[PDB]
């Protein structure tokens, strides 16, 4: 009968996107190891500078300049786990972060304005702790949004209390998907530790095992570690909070105009963060990350929706895969000041590259205005664009079955597979976009001839008006909120 | 001193995107052959059937089903030139089509409706012959549209005259660039040949030694070769005109719901058309094309701005590089009825994949509404998109200079490169979009707060109102004009 | 949430076995190419010598020695179909023979003796057409036997008529699988053509489009094309019958002691056949075959159960894949004069190697005594072996599901997977040997303490007295049976 | 003239068997570093448990559940040697165990029954310390048996004396080949260390330098480390006694039905044991071993003669080579009760797969009845198979001399090589089995139509009587024999 015995067969599952060779990967490494020694990094916080020294570095106390020897970069890289798991309040939302090409998406972070609908026209308005609750609710419904990252700032809590300890409980409550705090504060890290230890009722061990709060720090480009960042890392490590050491460098700005040199300036900064982490607590969960892009040597902005942002995040991932770490990179971002043709493009352009390259986590969903405004319409739109990607990422499955030769034959010359059994079993196999319109001119017209913004906007309302977000336990919540009030109290007592 | 010597070094220039492995490529191939022997392929054209029979196929004269032996696919593929040049009336538009990754873009083709303006809004009219004379004018200006493919059908010529011969002189007339005729007629291929022999002054050599015109054809899925097709090929071969054998299958409709299967069906049809071409005139200029997409088993239509399409065009571009022929795949399309947020995503998703796979020619620029409308506005957007795509395909160039180690050092800790000499030199290195906005909310708002559609629209006007298209010779034009006239004459006959 | 998106992942399905680098392959080819020009092969038949001569072959008529130019070796290898399919009378037995590693099995062909059981022990007596009938029925049951190949000879028809023609109708009659004739006779090739054509109701189109018969010739080692072999090709190619150009060299005998060298001699012999096949009729179905083995300079016999046999088939298989042709090779062959311990080892040693190598068709199933005797018992035992192989060929399927991390987890430390949901969905996943006894000592002895030999013998009997075979149509059989007679009478007429 | 200058050339020496890609290794790895953290590994022994905690391991003191951080796996591995040597009392038996594909064989261990010749038939009688004596004498002779591994138990010592110590000196005196103790005891490791120090005469460095004693232990599936096992690792590690950290999972019982998943469990277990040994003593010679098999939920037992076992070992050998350590896998085992066809087959299946993948040590020779009985006949047989296995691993040597185009010509069309020089010189080159019969039928019948089993029985007999085992210096044996006494004496003091 038909064969069912085959010899070794080499296959390709999904889509492979190559940006470097080892000889090239290594060069980028060497150049960074050089830069790490001259000039080195400016580590402002003294405690961190202390840890660096103890472990073998060369710290210049008058200029706060540390020189990291490759052997530490090496050692650091051996301590770090190649994988850890982000937890949610609903285990179903858990998300894994592991050295590989297993792609996950998260929303933008962190904007200051919100693109809400006013009198017929969408209006850019200043964000507030409440806007955060709405986004959080929305992203709790968006499937492709694995976990939540602080979308906008609680500006209205500015000089009022612990805005940062605020941007913690709000998210944890308006969603059950893991929370990634983009704006942490080195001195208030204990507050996050507490708020979580609170969720798991006074039990710390549990909050270390099932962490629901992770944070992001930023090496100040070029070649500097802010005191805020040093404490975020150190506290992040010791307590058990995953730490994303993401970078924001700009070709022609804080790093070379060339993409390659830029990567170096980035690698150096991010690697010094990761090093500082493992020297504090070996096995500290870390993220080799980046949001680096290029400086528009003209317009006067940080274009975050251009191929460069895409290529770099793409590359950053490949570098993370090379170092054995999980990647969190900029992706699905746009410089469009509105959800129009451009927006859709730049979003698709900056996400597909990093995804095919295997970015363990791409952030930018729902963002607009080069990271200034956050649009909920743009989000659900992006959240759909990802589904398309996840299909494309399916690439081409070549098997005797998928080849379907008999199938081709049964149908014969000049017929259709419509009736056929197989065709019916694969009704869902094809990509079925939630918001994209695949209708005739009639169907569409006889439905309002609405553009995607509108189609999406109508979706924004619906979700908000009915999505069901698993709420935090009655008492537990008041325990957590306790730490927030204590944080505001502490704060006002200048 | 500084080093200036290096041993063996393996580099990666560009962005390498992979879909298959050899073992898998072979697999696809066998299915394609295993199918080429059963059921086979229906060849309605009796002259074709003879050509096939003449070489060793099993031409069942009563059903027309030809059966092609792998060895004939082997000789076919060893005859078809791996590369051939396209010529625009303007030498500076020449476009090399060669088995490999050298990618090029060409506008969409060929719809029946145009998305133009009216009263503050865009409206869907029905294509005409004055439209083609404009689409051609724009594409002549569009710097990422290497050559011209028929945009929309000159409807005001149906039953009036030879719509095709009209659809030939009009384009060639309104664009120095090359012309790829989407809907040519097998019985009039000689008309075209002559319209060209004219431009060159009755010199059928300069007409061969400089194809300023090429054509397309689509085997009828699944596994059929329409009569018009076989003649477009046979004549195209005989006259020495570049023929593009593009498939039109639809997973879940005319081909297996699966892609691998769909590729087999596509491979089957496209190849046969290639074998038929070669057996006609060894060395005939052919293409391994495809517009194959998936039938939306949930909307009762053919989504062509979907990731499904993207993957198919990209896969075809590989099967193309595999056998050894130039590719022409369906990319940069969208099922969006309006140049909105969707247009971007869809256009980008579908153009990217083939662009990165190495499609030798990607077409669909300007399209909209699954392929019924041609927005002059989207065309320009897509053209600015292609530009961005290009910077992308440059990936990361890792060299001792691009790594800029010394640069990082002269600037050092906490400073900028704005000053740096090297940086002042690379001012035109970073991607610079023509339409895409990258300003602040302020700057942009004080512009009118124009969305890309509106902005892309004002660009069209500017182009149509001021683009100087290199005009055909005065007489030369009147000569060709006649070929169209005589053609229309015979028509009314 | 749970990951459902991954990029470029290279995987290995099944088990891969390598024998050569492309350089060694090419090298072997180069020897072969030169050996064809010097000394060249001896084409005993004039018709073929002519055919060769016409396409540009230096043909010395005084010695019949033909020299083949590389470009012809090339032309032919490009003319031979990469794939063709064997047809059984039951479309549910059809077997695909196509370049690659799609492994298939067939019984041995063809011994002169039959090893049966008489007075308690095993008795090796001479075969008779009846035996052929019994083997045919037996194999029509065995799953792993894709198709049937003339197992033994009708030594009783010897002298009474044309045995080879009887050797055609009997097999085609006792089994509805495909029939591969190991002993065709060049002059009678037409008799086969008709029995088949007869079967199809005279329609030759159907006989050519659905070959129910195929045959194998043999280059005469070292470097000779016997007329018998020449006619089989020329006539096979013309009629439309799959021809198997299989070599039978012997290291230390008709080829060097080394194996690399024996492969050259073989390669030279086999290709010369294909050159003929294609030059006769372009596109003729062909098989790159071998059963070459090493000679045991010590024992004076050419062992066909030695590792060298296995090594050689494996190599030939690869050589076929190199030239783009389907392969037919030895394997699953033993030298032991009875189904004992030796038997099982040699069977495996020679079937395992060629199999993991991708041989398109392994033949030798149910054979004993250096290819002299056919063992009804060893055929079922072997058949089951082919199963344990098909399983082994699955190797390790590594996917998110196979890794089944959750599975290991839900079960947890110090527990059993016994009553776990997934375990019960894979109840039939493991290898389930039909003969090989996998019972405790107890359960076995309480079943007669039967060794594999006897246990087999019993399932042999059951299969014969109980297996049904799709009979050929009454009307048709007499038509074919008539072709047999028109040949027997004509044989006697001398 | 004749060339003797050739540019770069890629060659494949032997046969290569693949199973995973790197992406797939990384995959299997992560799942092990995922499991190694959750659930974790239960360490029964507190002394070892302390060692884990000491080195940053999170111990759940109450449940005894140790969570091993990936970095401890990485560090453990960096410490472990990539090679070490096994010594025999006879310098000529020294066996190297090194990361790579250098294959070696050792007898099965450790059954409790000896298949011996009763009244004309084979009987399964319970073993005794004496059995070990002879089995040791047998193996000593078997050239394809690198070193000896306690095959049967000194059953007649249970509840009478220090059995395991009897299972030490006994093997050691009845063979000069290295002895691997399959079942050592955590509280007697010191007796062994002393006994060895005795052979060398006080010099412990000699005992460290030339270990003539190694020992194995088995983690408890799934995810457990019995008290005894832990002590084995620790003591062996501290004394400089190699230690085989061999796992014994069962697909469908203690590990996922799938093999990928099972391997993951195998990995977690076998690694933890490696991590322990290392943390206890950096540089402790160890083994990444396994005998994990499948479990026919049907037959009611775990068959160690199935293709599953075959694949598993192979898979484990690769993993072993992946991590840089030596392998000790199960192979050359059978489920058959009597040495019949099944034996010879199942043995070649389980032994060939690992030999090819390149197991650094394969063990299962001389075994039958799913690991219950130890056949002395099957032993001499398996050993002779390994010879055929060894030839097979020679694959095809492609070279100017091996291709031998001159030789092919020197002989020419239709003439043999038997008379040729190159042939008479290579008379020893082909595989020459000791028991596999390659005689024609006639010669065989004369020999008395003896199967392989009995011809094997006659060989065992011939060996047990006449093979001489090197005498341990009489005096030294006294010293050694003495320490075994102190082992018994002490034993009765409880
Ligand atoms: Na694939
Ligand atoms: Na590059
Ligand atoms: Na696999
Ligand atoms: Na070799």
Residue numbers in the entry:
A (entry chain D), C (entry chain A), D (entry chain F): 2 to 495
B (entry chain C): 2 to 494
Q: What are the paper's exact sentences on this?
A:
The 22nd genetically encoded amino acid, pyrrolysine, plays a unique role in the key step in the growth of methanogens on mono-, di-, and tri-methylamines by activating the methyl group of these substrates for transfer to a corrinoid cofactor. A substrate:corrinoid methyltransferase catalyzes the demethylation of the specific methylamine, and subsequently transfers this methyl group onto an associated corrinoid protein. In summary, we have determined the structures of native MttB, and its complexes with a substrate analog, sulfite, and its physiological relevant corrinoid protein, MttC. These structures have provided new insights into the mechanism of activation of pyrrolysine that is distinct from the previously determined MtmB structure, and details of the key steps in the pyrrolysine-mediated transfer of methyl groups from methylamine substrates to the cobalamin cobalt in corrinoid proteins.
In our first structure of a pyrrolysine-containing protein, the monomethylamine methyltransferase MtmB, we demonstrated that addition of dithionite to MtmB crystals resulted in addition of a sulfite group to the pyrrolysine imine carbon. We sought to use a similar approach to clarify the details of the conformational states of pyrrolysine in MttB and to provide a structure of this protein bound to a substrate analog. Thus, a MttB crystal was soaked with dithionite and the structure of the resulting MttB-sulfite complex was determined to 3.2 Å resolution. As expected, addition of sulfite to the pyrrolysine imine carbon of MttB was observed with only one strong peak for the sulfite sulfur consistent with a single pyrroline conformation. While the structures of MttB and the MttB-sulfite complex are nearly the same (RMSD = 0.458 and 0.492 Å for the A subunits and overall hexamer, respectively), one significant change was the loss of the water that hydrogen bonds the pyrroline nitrogen in the native MttB structure. It should be noted that the water that hydrogen bonds the pyrroline imine nitrogen in the native MttB structure is absent in both the sulfite-bond MttB and the MttB-MttC complex. This may suggest that during turnover, addition of TMA to pyrrolysine may precede MttC binding—since nucleophilic addition to pyrrolysine would be slower without a hydrogen bond donor.
